[model samples]
Target: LRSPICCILGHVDTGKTKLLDKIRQTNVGGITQQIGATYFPVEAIKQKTAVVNKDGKFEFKVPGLLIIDTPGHESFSNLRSRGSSLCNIAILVVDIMHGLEPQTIESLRLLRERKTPFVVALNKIDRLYGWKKIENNGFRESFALQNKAVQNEFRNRLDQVKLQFAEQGFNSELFYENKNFARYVSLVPTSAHTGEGIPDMLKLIVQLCQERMAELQATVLEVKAGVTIDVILSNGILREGDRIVLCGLEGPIKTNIRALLTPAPKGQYIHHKEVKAAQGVKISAPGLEGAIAGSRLLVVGPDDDEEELEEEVESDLQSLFSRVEKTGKGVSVQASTLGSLEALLDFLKDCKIPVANVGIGPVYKRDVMQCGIMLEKAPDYAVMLCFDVKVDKEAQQYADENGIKIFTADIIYHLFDQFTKHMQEQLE
Candidate 1:
């Protein structure tokens, strides 16, 4: 893959997973109906990845892309923060009809924080009622995509995409000034059902990588690259064998895993085997021994040395089920990445916000212990916002067990949504 840590983030029902399936399953078309997804956060779900249409606009151009099929906004936010942090680019799937949702806007905001350039897949264009011409953008259940004029209307469509984002307070110069956000943003109108702009999306991904080829190829296998997920674990093993999006390393490792490099869901374990680069596979692993569904995971490694891997990774990292950051002893108002200590300072402002100390990535038992120390008068009611960050499940449970109000959110808005609902409930 030309791009090392590429990903897609969008709102729920915005076709994030549906689109991922279409892009991956496009080539085979009717040959096979089973498009795969890698790493789904729930036991009831399984996913698969394919090379044919993985890139947004693939039919017209070939872009070497590595994507994590985030099932929803929460998963996307977490993965984008951790794995996509090193990404050369990202895709924001916006449902044109719904315009922008709270989750969609927040995802975009987070990407802006990460400074990862992105393209807009103007999804669900087929839903637009009436017009001179309306074809399709992606996996078309309709037959209208077979027309030639759809290709001819490309420029007009690009113009529409630009306008839509601008309306949402998002500005990109690339589509206009011969470059969007300096060619950083390409608004490709697509229909996962009709497969309209999918080709263009792929082409843009290809072109961007080609432009930055030499630099991106250097870190395809980032040793520390990680993506988070909400998953189902069973008896020390991540059972869903098909939900993993493998990257960075080479392997024929075992699917029946003996350990996990990811840390979350407290006792959840990994029993999975080797997965190929850019290929999404299902896995089973040891450790947690079967954690609950709706828990978070930070997919890191099945690397060379097992002992070193175990030492570096955590078995009980943390969970950011719902919360937001606050100002603290030295925390800044804004943070770029959540892992860095300075970033902790960012989530935690020095003066205003009610925080005393902060840690980055996963809420460990120690973090909860510290949260306790700060709990004596931790104010602003700022629980904890993990984002693509983390918190040890044990510590999270401890806070809950002790009746301390601590929360986490993997998806930007969902975190706030939970907060809103929680407050609403309190008022009741």
Candidate 2:
């Protein structure tokens, strides 16, 4: 069986990466700026949890775990969504000292929306006041070593975190005390600094995988080397010279894979004749420059009908764009990726904001011209909201000359904040 993909997500500085470093015995910057994947072999899991699984017959059917580390900052929600949807299970890390923060709640919402099972990592437990370190011990052992006051502090903090989860509609209990895995989210108190509770966390994740397996879907992750695309092959086998169809910014792209390359050690790629599901590979093919990130990828066989496959892909793509097509009068929306556009639309709908027109990629002169139409028909709806994308110089100049306001921000909420503030001023 292939390795289960697990993702680490939480608010910034909540020790998500620190916990990962403790588990992976590697390093990251104080913050994560992008999505990163690491492979953890069952051999390493066996070695690390040798102390905890003593005298137990814990069989590992899966080869290892493919853990994805995502940026916890709100601006990276697109990446977060992509990573969350790609994983079989998630580890939601929270600083036990601070409880749940904004990004933590945001991640919980995503996990719930995606219907992906997750566990809570009550990280930074060693930061508790008066707590004593018990090296190479499970959480129970470590807690037992602490003095009464320190133990009390930890319990109080744990209760607060549990209460926060309750507020978010999740039933959470300590991992060991948890009676129903399906009904209750397991909370493992961990110290990334001291490496406590990590073994339990790993053991719990493996057990979860043993009991469950997840389905898969593929998506374009990035476009590299001009004509090559990096794809996350979630299901099915992709072979060299296979005809593929990808959703593009302007239209659908149909091409054949010239070569497939999987990443190797030391910043290299190994040529592969075929790659199976649930892996990442660089696919070199012509006419891939227009392939959009977060768009669906479809594979076609020589015996299969290409026309029918193309129509299916085209219709799927059209339906996504049709949902955001202009209705009545509303502001224009543009985002960096298809997923980001959908997220922006979801947020706008929640806030009762109407969208006039929507498109993917950087704002262009034609987009500004299209938005400018609302200036005469409905001046209030003439604004443009750009998320995580740039405005073309020509488009910016045209909007300025035409008195069309364009709001831009890397963060989604901030983009709406600016728009609402502008509307308030206009009302005044």
Candidate 3:
């Protein structure tokens, strides 16, 4: 079986990357930076879990985990979506003092949309007043060693996070106290700086991923000509010469794998005849010139009907394209991927703004030309909104010369705010 793909997500300064750094220290030899993943072997997992379980009562059968650390800022929503959608489980880091911030809420919405199961890391407990660090001890042991006043402070802060989760329509409790995993999200109190509760978080994630192993999925990451593609296999196996279907810009891309490759210790790709699920791998295949990044890949077995699979893939793409339908007249929007486009459109709906035209990928001269059409009909809505995507030089120059407003921002809220402010200035 392939190692489970885990993602770290939360608000800025919540210690998402710090927590990943702490975990990465355990397996120094297995680190891979090509895709920014830390490979935590089962042996290392057992060593860490021992900090919490003295007798080693909990045993992990899985080989290892691939944890991806994501940026907490809203501008990286495109990257966050890829991490969230491809991972088997997610760790939602929440600072105990600040509780849930804007990015935290946004992360929750993404998780909810994908229905991805996650555990909450109530981080920065060490920042509490009168708190003391217990070296080389698990959270339970260290927490017990704290004074009564400190314990009370801890409880108060934990309750605050629980309250925030309730407001977000979720039931949460301490990991140890939680009985039903599906009914309530597990909260692990942690200090990423001091390494407290790290063991417990790892244990819980391993258990959760194990319980959900029956289900399966995979996603495309990068496309190169040859066409070797970087991808994450979240479940099942991909063997050399296996037939596969992937979503493409023109339509479904049908291809057969010629080889599977994995990164070696010396920065080389070691060839593999077969690769299992929950791993990042490179696939060399033919007829993949049009493969799209961030798209889902489906494997076709010899016994399975090929026509039926093609039809199903086509329908999925149809529904995805339907979300970005051009309306009568409004702002033109461009995003990096299909998922990001949907998110931008949803935000626009909440803002009560109509979208005249929508397209994926970097904004081109054509986009500026299209929005120019709206200038004659409705100058106010003749704006081009670019979210987590680039505006080509030609497009920018054309918008400037044509008196078209081009609002570009990595963060969705900031992009909308600029447009809102522009409208307010016009009113004044």
- lDDT of predicted model 2: 0.76
What stretches of model 2 exceed 4 Å from their correct place? 26-36, 72-85, 214-216, 225-227, 314-316, 388-398, 408-417
Write the residue-wise lDDT of candidate 2 on 1-428 in tens digits.
Answer: 67776767777898887788888773321221112366676777777676678876888787777676756422222333454446778899999988988667867876776577788899988888887887656888788878999988988998888999999999999999998988899999999999999988988998897786633356676666567876666566788888888777677789998988765646566777887755767788888877776666778875778777777656644655666635568888888766567677778888888888887777998999889998988898889999778789999999999999989975677777888998898798
User: Model-by-model lDDT, in order?
Assistant: 0.43, 0.76, 0.76
Top-TM-score candidate index: 2
Model 3: residues >4 Å from true position, as ranges? Answer: 1-3, 27-36, 55-63, 72-85, 129-131, 177-183, 211-216, 222-228, 241-244, 250-259, 284-291, 299-318, 324-327, 415-428
Candidate 2: give the clashing pairs: none
> Clashing pairs in model 3?
233-278
Candidate 3: lDDT of 383?
Answer: 89
Task: Please report, as a residue range, the 10-residue window in candidate 1 with the lowest summed lDDT.
Answer: 215-224
After TM-score superposition, what is the CA distance of residue 294 in candidate 1 from its true location, in Å? 16
- For candidate 3, what is the TM-score? 0.81
- The estimated TM-scores of all candidates read 0.53, 0.85, 0.81
User: For all the candidates, what are their Cα RMSDs to the real structure?
Assistant: 11.0, 4.4, 4.1
What does the lDDT read for residue 182 in candidate 2?
81
